[PDB]
């Protein structure tokens, strides 16, 4: 045994159901919101600093770029919250853990996330 054996882990060849997409996007959104908490904390500190600081924070938020970042943060956090509440319901026992029920819950979570993302976009904009 001079060299260790290989391992087929080419994710480009494997296939995943919608239930795995849900969890992977949930983790991605978790990290995204982990960073967004600090971003929003800085922005809120700037705002609450003083009247001129509030004006500066408003000017920053008025940026098209900043608008896009804020909308993305809102959408990621909404998706994370929805999928996490779905996971907690499945854990406690308010949703059957069958493949069919899993895909149904995933699609419902996706639609509700799209809804919440639009609703928050009309706000940030």
């Amino acid at each position: 045994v001079k060299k260790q054996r290989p391992v087929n882990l080419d994710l480009q060849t494997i296939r995943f159901p919608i239930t795995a997409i849900a969890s992977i996007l949930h983790r991605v959104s978790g990290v995204i919101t982990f960073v967004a908490v600090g971003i929003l904390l800085w922005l809120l500190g700037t705002s609450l600093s003083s009247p001129e600081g509030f004006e500066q924070a408003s000017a920053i938020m008025g940026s098209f770029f900043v608008k896009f970042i804020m909308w993305g943060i809102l959408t990621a956090l909404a998706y994370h919250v929805v999928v996490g509440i779905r996971h907690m319901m499945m854990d406690f026992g308010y949703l059957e853990e069958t493949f069919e029920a899993g895909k149904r819950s995933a699609k419902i979570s996706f639609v509700i996330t799209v809804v919440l993302s639009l609703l928050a976009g009309v706000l940030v904009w």
Partner: protein, 113 residues
């Protein structure tokens, strides 16, 4: 225990995550309800809302819950996708420091206004 996570066992981390998640959902509900009904937003109403004791206490509690939840979740993610020991330890240390700074800054901001 793993001597490096903000937990004690599987059940401990499970219950902590779930409780802090419920708390953070309540906080998000409160914040969205405010931002929605606020209508026109000016420095006046901004300061009037973030000057109440309930709002600041709620924000601090949400920051604490976020500290706990993010620590647990990031420890999990790092243990999943970081094999090297030194790199994972440094990343988790940076994350925990960032979260403690999150809490301390939330304070320094809420008791400032």
């Amino acid at each position: 225990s793993n001597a490096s996570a903000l937990g004690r066992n599987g059940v401990h981390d499970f219950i902590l995550v779930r409780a802090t998640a419920i708390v953070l959902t309540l906080y998000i509900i409160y914040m969205v309800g405010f931002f929605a009904t606020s209508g026109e937003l000016t420095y006046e109403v901004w300061i009037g809302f973030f000057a109440s004791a309930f709002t600041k206490v709620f924000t601090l509690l949400a920051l604490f819950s976020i500290l706990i939840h993010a620590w647990i979740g990031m420890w999990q993610v790092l243990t999943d996708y970081v094999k090297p020991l030194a790199l994972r330890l440094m990343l988790q240390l940076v994350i925990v420091v960032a979260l403690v700074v999150y809490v301390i800054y939330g304070f320094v901001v809420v008791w400032g206004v």
